[PDB]
């Protein structure tokens, strides 16, 4: 209460309570004035592959999505050797202290006060009728390490745009524009702070194993199975074989590899590729309304050993990186790459095809011949692993509500919810600088500049799978780099900067197939 | 109370239910000071068709009467097109957060 | 009950309570003798795409399964210019009023 | 119940108890089968004053509105003789003994048969979903004879039509189609009958009285008044005269002669009229969208004495005249006339106009001078008499909902009300005729040739006014003309033909103003 008290504590640790583990974080915001209190449409030019037709903002939004802003390297570390699994169960939201400051420019010197009256005011969106930006894996996340202080991003969305003569961002009858003052939000002074809590729906456990078995390898050796096939036509007589005696593509099999298809891969070293200047001519591409799109990332599919490929796979980058860019003779130092290797046991690789076919019919004259199949689709009885979840990568999306979806979990990775964690908006209360005397009925154009600052916090109740496996001899597991290093791994360099070394991937210990 | 916390909430929203609808709608306001606090009579010159007398006041007022101050252009579609007619019953009224400000 | 008094009456109309919707229609209908009280299979000829074998059987039947039957285009519009879904729960059928004439 | 018993019984009386007169009626109708079942649009052709859009419906409807319905000559006698007032309360209508009849031609002769299984379908409409085209003053009412059968009349509507190029006939985006099945009728064979329950809302007691002293006239005779004007301006000073000393033109008085409007006036001598082919040009006329309406019944302005108008005053007809048109040297035998000159105390005469007024402002070189108005409207403070009702004329009529009307009485006379009697609507159910073996998709174009007919009743509880008047003398009453005639009044002639002899209106009785 009162602007001499203050409205909350720092809460940042992690709890691991048998099958249970909750995880507290804090950190220190920064909120300015976007868009000078003024909403603002917002479209390309011209007829092409990006255009767009949508609003810009003067809100703004937190966004706690990503892992690691939950997780410190040492707790994904003993999570992810301890467990085969992990869901979320609940979450609880808070900001307190927050603190309003003005800003006054004489001659070119700013000079910041402190505005114990002013407000902002912030609601959660419960019901999910404003546009969902989340999950679409943006900036502006909690940062990874707790001293961190980060600003928060602006809020905005797009919508329908239409074919107008040269210009396909001309807007439709049907472009929607929602206000976010037609909101019931909550106005919060100094001495007041802000909560709400969540509750997770029922998913399953992402799988934190890699397969202890190939599908083709699954059988045992030592004897050959009762099934019988037609080996060899020759002699003008069938002779059937049958299946065993340690020829192991004879088998016959339950279950078939995951779907796929095939992807360009590009050698690691850069001297054996091919000098293209853009790989957007060669890129896996699926198209919508006309214009093309990337397909990235696809389906779960490794590439070869030593290979990568175009938007394949998730990729990150240190602090070390600013820009849009970073080039090497092989791939760069501060370029984060992932692996999907662990997956080649039952999902299909991206280097070739995912089997043959016959080709045609066959008589006495003529030789039987088969084609190539390079893309596969979903078929009955097929298993696959879904892309697994990194330190740095997204927790959740929202599954887009439609008359159908299969299998709907991100293609990024994640789990897939049909009513995610409410987006949390947030804005500076605008206050009009000195009107004039006599009446004037437009709009008031100047105001007051002036931002805010406070602290939030993300608790999250993450459940876990114990693990019981009887296996003999010892398994990988996540282990510090053994090089003395200048720095010291996931820690601040002498200039003070966090730099994450490499991602981690959940997937340690194995299970049975 | 006191300086420190806030004397109210946003409230913008219209609630349909059954037969009644009940629109809420907030606004910033900014308010100077006229005349230097004094009272002022007006009047015109002359004769003519327009010719008048009155004061003029160091005072200032709300005024919501307009319609679209309570409803948004999708509330008034959704209400011409469903219904035979409509009329007022209660109105609520607020202010809160008031802040002054010296130059 | 007897000759003299009516099994049923006309019921053709449309309810809209809170979330739920009734719909009422009642059409006159008229049944010849169909293949002079026989069964006879059906059959096609030769080779080719449309091929078939069959039964005609002297039997008629009642079919409501098309939408309109239930909506009339002002309740069509009414219904889909102000709601996100709909689905049927629960259905009621009669027949009444039967009269058997002889040629 | 059954087809051997009866449904109902004959009830046609009036019984006399007090301040209530209750009032049964009994007819036999006939229904046909209108538009082969079908439902058609009605349309006008080209520009013109009389253009229309329509509906014509195969329906069929009672009509009891007019007042002979409802009493016989006696009884209106016995009623306007006696009271001063009356209105109606509550009304009670049935039908029974329906029988449905089929019709079968073989070569040129009809066979006329009796289906037992058929049904007739009736509703009312209580809500007034539909169109109302009762209060129109249409024919195919019970007959005022109880030994008339009558036969129903068809339903119909019409509704807007719209600007096309040479036609004004084109249908509006907003020109209603009402289908009468989409209502929840009611079927009934020939043992089962129908029956409904109504009841007025309160509405004033129209007046039979006849005043029994004149605005102008209000006043004692034998004193002067009080109050001073000026009379005369002559020798350079003003003169004040004192009202009083019996000259009444200058008397002050609170109230003035009621609204009304100048009318063409046309004598009963037919040497004297000017030969007009059509009296159209020269009616009073009001016009709507752009088409002009003869202007009909106006106020009840009376004409001259030996005078009448067009269209000013309602008129009837006997039995005797057939056909659109009759024609005589003075207003022919078989038209009933009537006429409002027991309102010349109060309304105005339609002979000239309303009064005069000040035309211009003085000084002592010109004179002051005065121009006529020809036409009033409602002012404060002024009185006026309704348009009487007759023995012939219609009972009441729907105010149409709207957002004002004033003094909403019909101009035809009656009680207007908010909400009226509702209609009533009768089918025959179509019966096909027998279809063909092979299936074919197409609407059944052959139906069984079937009418049907029955009994009604309607009984109506008549609210009145008693008559206390302390005036020595004796008063006009209504009485039989005194002739000895060929055919007794109000009775059949030879031929069996029942023939009102003359409208009776209901004011004879006088009242103080």
Same mark, same amino acid.
């Given at each position: 209460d009162g602007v001499g008290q203050s409205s909350g504590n720092w809460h940042c640790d992690s709890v691991w309570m048998g099958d249970r583990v909750l995880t507290k974080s804090t950190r220190t915001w920064s909120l300015p004035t976007y868009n000078n209190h003024l909403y603002k449409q917002i479209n390309g030019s011209g007829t092409g592959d990006a255009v767009y037709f949508g609003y810009s903002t003067p809100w703004g939004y937190f966004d706690f999505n990503r892992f690691h802003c939950h997780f410190s390297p040492r707790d994904w570390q003993r999570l992810v050797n301890n467990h085969w699994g992990i869901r979320p169960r609940r979450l609880n939201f808070k900001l307190f202290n927050i603190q309003v400051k003005e800003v006054t420019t004489t001659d070119g010197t700013k000079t910041i006060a402190n505005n114990l009256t002013s407000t902002v005011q912030v609601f959660a969106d419960t019901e999910h009728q404003l546009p969902y930006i989340l999950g679409s894996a943006h900036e502006g996340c909690m940062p990874p390490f707790p001293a961190d202080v980060f600003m928060l991003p602006q809020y905005g969305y797009l919508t329908l745009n239409g074919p107008g003569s040269n210009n396909n961002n001309l807007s439709t009858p049907s472009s929607a524009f929602y206000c976010l003052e037609y909101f019931p939000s909550q106005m919060l002074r100094t001495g007041n702070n802000f909560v709400f809590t969540y509750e997770f729906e029922k998913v399953p456990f992402?799988? &934190?194993? &890699?397969?202890?078995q190939a599908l083709d390898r699954l059988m045992n050796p030592l004897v050959d199975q009762y099934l019988w096939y037609l080996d060899a036509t020759s002699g003008n007589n069938l002779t059937f074989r049958k299946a065993g005696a340690k020829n192991f593509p004879e088998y016959f099999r339950n279950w078939i590899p995951g779907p796929g298809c095939r992807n360009q891969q590009w050698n690691k070293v850069g001297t054996k590729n091919n000098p293209q200047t853009g790989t957007w001519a060669s890129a896996?591409?699926?198209?919508? +309304?006309?214009?093309?799109?990337?397909?990235?990332?696809? +389906?779960?599919?490794?590439?070869?050993?030593?290979?990568?490929?175009?938007?394949g796979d998730l990729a990150f980058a240190n602090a070390k990186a600013t820009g849009a860019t970073t080039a090497a003779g092989t791939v760069p130092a501060d370029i984060l790459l992932t692996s999907e290797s662990e997956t080649t046991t039952t999902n299909m690789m991206s280097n070739n095809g995912w089997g043959a076919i016959a080709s045609n019919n066959q008589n006495a004259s003529v030789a039987p011949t088969v084609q190539y199949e390079d893309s596969a689709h979903v078929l009955p009885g097929m298993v696959w692993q879904d892309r697994d979840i990194y330190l740095q990568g997204p927790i959740w999306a929202k599954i887009p509500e439609t008359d159908g979806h299969f299998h709907p979990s991100p293609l990024m990775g994640g789990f897939g919810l049909k009513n995610p964690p409410p987006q949390i908006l947030i804005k500076n209360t605008p206050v009009p600088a000195d009107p004039p005397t006599q009446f004037s009925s437009q709009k008031i154009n100047s105001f007051i500049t002036q931002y805010s600052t406070g602290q939030m916090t993300v608790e999250i109740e993450w459940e876990l799978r114990k693990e019981n496996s009887k296996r003999w001899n010892p398994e990988i597991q996540y282990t510090a780099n053994f090089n003395n290093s200048a720095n010291a791994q996931f820690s601040v360099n002498n200039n003070g900067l966090y730099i994450e070394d490499r991602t981690i991937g959940t997937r340690y210990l194995t299970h049975t197939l």
């Open positions: 992402h799988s &934190m194993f &890699m397969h202890n896996n591409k699926w198209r919508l +309304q006309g214009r093309l799109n990337k397909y990235a990332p696809g +389906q779960p599919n490794a590439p070869a050993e030593g290979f990568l490929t175009n938007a």
